[PDB]
Design a protein around this nucleic acid. Structure first.
Ligand SMILES: [Mg+2]
Ligand SMILES: [Mg+2]
Ligand SMILES: [Mg+2]
Ligand SMILES: [Mg+2]
Ligand SMILES: [Mg+2]
Ligand SMILES: [Mg+2]
Ligand SMILES: [Mg+2]
Ligand SMILES: [Mg+2]
Ligand SMILES: [Mg+2]
Ligand SMILES: [Mg+2]
Ligand SMILES: [Mg+2]
Ligand SMILES: [Mg+2]
Ligand SMILES: [Mg+2]
Ligand SMILES: [Mg+2]
Ligand SMILES: [Mg+2]
Ligand SMILES: [Mg+2]
Ligand SMILES: [Mg+2]
Ligand SMILES: [Mg+2]
Ligand SMILES: [Mg+2]
Ligand SMILES: [Mg+2]
Ligand SMILES: [Mg+2]
Ligand SMILES: [Mg+2]
Ligand SMILES: [Mg+2]
Ligand SMILES: [Mg+2]
Ligand SMILES: [Mg+2]
Ligand SMILES: [Mg+2]
Ligand SMILES: [Mg+2]
Ligand SMILES: [Mg+2]
Ligand SMILES: [Mg+2]
Ligand SMILES: [Mg+2]
Ligand SMILES: [Mg+2]
Ligand SMILES: [Mg+2]
Ligand SMILES: [Mg+2]
Ligand SMILES: [Mg+2]
Ligand SMILES: [Mg+2]
Ligand SMILES: [Mg+2]
Ligand SMILES: [Mg+2]
Ligand SMILES: [Mg+2]
Ligand SMILES: [Mg+2]
Ligand SMILES: [Mg+2]
Ligand SMILES: [Mg+2]
Ligand SMILES: [Mg+2]
Ligand SMILES: [Mg+2]
Ligand SMILES: [Mg+2]
Ligand SMILES: [Mg+2]
Ligand SMILES: [Mg+2]
Ligand SMILES: [Mg+2]
Ligand SMILES: [Mg+2]
Ligand SMILES: [Mg+2]
Ligand SMILES: [Mg+2]
Ligand SMILES: [Mg+2]
Ligand SMILES: [Mg+2]
Ligand SMILES: [Mg+2]
Ligand SMILES: [Mg+2]
Ligand SMILES: [Mg+2]
Ligand SMILES: [Mg+2]
Ligand SMILES: [Mg+2]
Ligand SMILES: [Mg+2]
Lengths: 54, 113, 44, 90
RNA sequence: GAAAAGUACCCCGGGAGGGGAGUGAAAGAGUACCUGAAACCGUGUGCCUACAAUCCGUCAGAGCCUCCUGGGUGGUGAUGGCGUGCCUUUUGAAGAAUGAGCCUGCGAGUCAGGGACAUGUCGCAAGGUUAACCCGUGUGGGGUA
RNA sequence: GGGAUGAGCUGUGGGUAGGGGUGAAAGGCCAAUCAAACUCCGUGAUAGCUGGUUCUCCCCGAAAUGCAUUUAGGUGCAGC
RNA sequence: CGCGGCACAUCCACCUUGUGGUGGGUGUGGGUAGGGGAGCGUCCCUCAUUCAGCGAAGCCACCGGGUGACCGGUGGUGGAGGGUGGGGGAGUGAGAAUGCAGGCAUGAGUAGCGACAAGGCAAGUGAGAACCUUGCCCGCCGAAAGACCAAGGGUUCCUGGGCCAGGCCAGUCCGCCCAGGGUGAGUCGGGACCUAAGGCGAGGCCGACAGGCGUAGUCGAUGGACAACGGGUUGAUAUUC
């Protein structure tokens, strides 16, 4: 099956605006005396210093 | 109304739509917060955009001489650059068209309380 | 003939069927060579 | 060409009107000359002078006033000698 | 760009790219470069919009917003009515007949001939006109076949 | 799945050329094209057929009938 | 019907009573094919005139205007040509031709990312590593998924660099990009030896011409003849050094 007609701007945008990135939950951590912000699931690794902070 | 700095990353090799997907997470936040979200966003476009905000913040602090801590990405937007054109062979002798889309990413940060 | 394409290269047969000396052996061939010179083809 | 290297010329058109100058080198193919002090170009380090079109300079007379020049024959060699107008010297 | 004067130096960046400086009349000319339209893609913003069936407009019309002096612009448009795309081709198409995704550019009664007919107009007029050709820097003057 | 010492398969080199070739014959094949290849040229072939033919306004404004027609979805003349 | 604007045809009265204007009547003004009439806009030329680096064209916005095509003004942008009028001439107007070229949408961040051998960990390099390097485990082919030659390709080989294109992801890697280097023969495979099919073919025969065929001859390997083995070595050649 092929598109019968081109979508209007409105219909294309209504669908397309729903393609967005999932926001990551971020929490504050303090390792080595300095503050940083990391995803919550990576807090354990952040405290063990296993997270390259860039 | 607020002192500001601009950075542009021109002809960056990411689709404008994917760049927009990753900048909609950081539009309007502080520079430090935006850099953290982009650090932790799995989307590959987060890299280039992150260094665009970093460059804008650096311009603000070095050329503008203003405080990095009070700095917010006021307006970030990705528009389309030139698109390269490639041919991908398909079945039965058809040749389809691939588009290498590039982006121009503009960031304006301003300093404000 | 499954899978075998029409052009099987062989430079000696290319030269003996389409080569310059083959062209020059007939008036039609010389006409072709002069026509390609006149058009300005690099390859004659 | 009628403007050679050694002779001094006066700029008659451009930014530096009335600029006395001496031709460092002539480019007859491009019809330009390099003149001392003319269109001082501030080049970024890592300030020099850029060539000026020969139409914009007139050869000085070595007797003051600028001039157009023509030629005559010296009768000794048969060579055509560059000479001035306004009493047609040198 | 008139001229490479083609952006030294500093800063972010692995680079790309950019910012500040600097050159330039101009960088609203930065070797992706004159002018820089449209399609198309964002970002910001004013109004509307999540109980409504919409050829997408039109007329009526509140309310907001904006800019000027209750009034008038400009934007929007709750709500009411009316309202079956364009082209081709058909007796008849909104048609579920054809063609068109969009924009920009291009794409179709032209020219020749003392041709033919008819007309408008102008010159000369019982006449009119030359053709080849000849002579002239020409578009002018000759040239009666 | 069929043949697989044979009317076998296959390499290399060669020959047959377009009303011609070749065909254990299917109008098969002759460079992904074959009831007559391909290219260039005649050539801007021709098509009573289909499509298209671009700015404006003002005035008037049809026909889809007759006759004839290798004619009937064309055309001539008439009618309008 | 009322009030106002326009137009066409026709009539009547004044003004050089037809080139016709003015006023007033009267009638008329849906329209496809089609006929007739009158105009708008673009470009070029000529003549005159007038703007233009104190800013032309083109483009954009806004405000105005005309019965229409359309027009003007102002501002922005821009950087060298325009405006008006009498004429002259058109490659003079597009929305449609499954029209042509280019750019860009829609589908859509969708399908797909090319065999059903299968990857993993540690370490390294690096800005960046699922994919590159090293080691080790695991698995797969093994009448090939191994090693070679011919044809074909043409430098893809090696070294050192590179990493925005390419590689169906990424890439620090690469058959990609760049530079330099690299192929050594009396014996190998060919020629300088031989001929097959077939090709060309002195003269020749035949044919209006074009040309066809062919003798002598001369080519033409896929065949005949012909003298090398083993080992070592380079980053890259080796029956060649
Ligand atoms: Mg194929
Ligand atoms: Mg001059
Ligand atoms: Mg700069
Ligand atoms: Mg600047
Ligand atoms: Mg300056
Ligand atoms: Mg300018
Ligand atoms: Mg461009
Ligand atoms: Mg430009
Ligand atoms: Mg509601
Ligand atoms: Mg209903
Ligand atoms: Mg309505
Ligand atoms: Mg009809
Ligand atoms: Mg029908
Ligand atoms: Mg339809
Ligand atoms: Mg429909
Ligand atoms: Mg039909
Ligand atoms: Mg269609
Ligand atoms: Mg079997
Ligand atoms: Mg059996
Ligand atoms: Mg068997
Ligand atoms: Mg049959
Ligand atoms: Mg075939
Ligand atoms: Mg035939
Ligand atoms: Mg003909
Ligand atoms: Mg009528
Ligand atoms: Mg008729
Ligand atoms: Mg009418
Ligand atoms: Mg009426
Ligand atoms: Mg009509
Ligand atoms: Mg100026
Ligand atoms: Mg200006
Ligand atoms: Mg023009
Ligand atoms: Mg206008
Ligand atoms: Mg203007
Ligand atoms: Mg202008
Ligand atoms: Mg004009
Ligand atoms: Mg004129
Ligand atoms: Mg005209
Ligand atoms: Mg045209
Ligand atoms: Mg168009
Ligand atoms: Mg079209
Ligand atoms: Mg197209
Ligand atoms: Mg889908
Ligand atoms: Mg999938
Ligand atoms: Mg694969
Ligand atoms: Mg690792
Ligand atoms: Mg096994
Ligand atoms: Mg075995
Ligand atoms: Mg290699
Ligand atoms: Mg290498
Ligand atoms: Mg790469
Ligand atoms: Mg890649
Ligand atoms: Mg002979
Ligand atoms: Mg022969
Ligand atoms: Mg022989
Ligand atoms: Mg031989
Ligand atoms: Mg052999
Ligand atoms: Mg080797």
């Amino acid at each position: 099956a092929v598109p019968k007609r081109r979508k209007s701007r409105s219909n294309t945008r209504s669908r397309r605006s729903q393609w967005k990135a999932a926001k990551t939950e971020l929490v504050g951590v303090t390792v080595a005396g300095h503050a940083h912000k990391v995803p919550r699931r990576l807090l354990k690794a952040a405290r063990l210093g296993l997270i390259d902070f860039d | 109304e607020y002192p500001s700095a601009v950075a542009k990353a021109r002809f960056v090799r990411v689709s404008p739509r994917k760049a927009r997907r990753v900048i909609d997470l950081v539009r309007g936040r502080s520079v430090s917060d935006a850099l953290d979200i982009l650090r932790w966003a799995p989307q590959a476009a987060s890299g280039p955009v992150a260094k665009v905000i970093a460059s804008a913040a650096a311009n603000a602090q070095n050329n503008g001489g203003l405080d990095p801590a009070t700095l917010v990405v006021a307006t970030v937007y990705a528009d389309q650059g030139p698109t390269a054109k490639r041919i991908r062979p398909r079945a039965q002798g058809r040749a389809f068209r691939i588009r290498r889309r590039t982006s121009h990413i503009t960031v304006v940060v301003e300093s404000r309380p | 003939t499954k899978g075998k394409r029409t052009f099987q290269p062989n430079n000696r047969r290319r030269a003996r069927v389409h080569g310059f000396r083959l062209r020059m052996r007939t008036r039609a061939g010389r006409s072709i060579v002069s026509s390609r010179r006149r058009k300005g083809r690099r390859t004659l | 060409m009628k403007v050679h290297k050694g002779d001094t010329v006066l700029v008659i058109s451009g930014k530096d009107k009335g600029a006395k100058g001496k031709v460092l080198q002539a480019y007859p193919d491009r019809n330009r000359v390099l003149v001392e002090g003319v269109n001082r170009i501030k080049k970024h380090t890592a300030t020099q002078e850029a060539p000026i079109h020969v139409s914009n300079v007139m050869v000085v007379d070595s007797d003051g006033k600028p001039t157009r020049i023509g030629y005559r024959v010296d009768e000794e060699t048969g060579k055509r000698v560059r000479i001035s107008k306004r009493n047609g010297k040198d």
